[PDB]
């Protein structure tokens, strides 16, 4: 690799560098297994908790999105352009 060359990869949002959501596990209800993080053009908007193997309707910018979670907290939905909500399984769950 000679001097003056450049090299990078595509900039995939990395949840390992995200601080945890500022969550509150309400003691009256089951603890949700997942963290979610909402981004617009790779800029975090907010974050929270949700259930695994489940569903929710979430307002993502200008559009409601029906978000399904699998058992590993991967989140699927029809997100508007430039937006995404990404999940991860909480430590210990």
């Amino acid at each position: 690799m000679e001097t003056g060359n450049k090299y990078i990869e595509k900039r995939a949002i990395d949840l390992s560098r995200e601080r945890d959501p500022n969550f509150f596990d309400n003691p009256g209800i089951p603890v949700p297994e997942c963290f979610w993080f909402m981004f617009k053009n790779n800029v975090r908007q907010d974050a929270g908790t949700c259930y695994s193997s489940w569903k929710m309707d979430m307002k993502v910018g200008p559009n409601w999105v029906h978000i399904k979670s699998d058992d590993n907290c991967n989140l699927s939905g029809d997100f508007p352009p430039g937006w995404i909500v990404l999940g991860k399984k909480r430590p210990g769950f």
Binding site: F23, G28, D46, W54
Partner: protein, 81 residues
């Protein structure tokens, strides 16, 4: 249990200060059907409400009149075995 779950309703309420947060809390906690309410999120403006038979229409209208420009963030059911 399955079929009889609590409601989960999350608002985003842009908050001026802790005084707006206190008002949001007292309002939600005095609303019919509400079991409990918490404020958290990256801006401390995510208002998570759980309960049964909550009239979200009247609740969001009251928050908008008394607290600030509340928006729905989420409507879901609590997952309960």
């Amino acid at each position: 249990g399955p079929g009889g779950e609590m409601q989960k309703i999350v608002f985003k309420i842009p908050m001026v200060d802790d005084k707006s947060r206190t008002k949001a809390m007292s309002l939600v906690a005095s609303t019919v059907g509400v079991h409990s309410v918490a404020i958290a999120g990256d801006l401390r403006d995510q208002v998570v409400v759980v309960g049964d038979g909550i009239d979200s229409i009247n609740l969001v209208s009251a928050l908008r009149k008394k607290v600030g420009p509340a928006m729905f963030l989420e409507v879901s059911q609590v997952k309960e075995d």
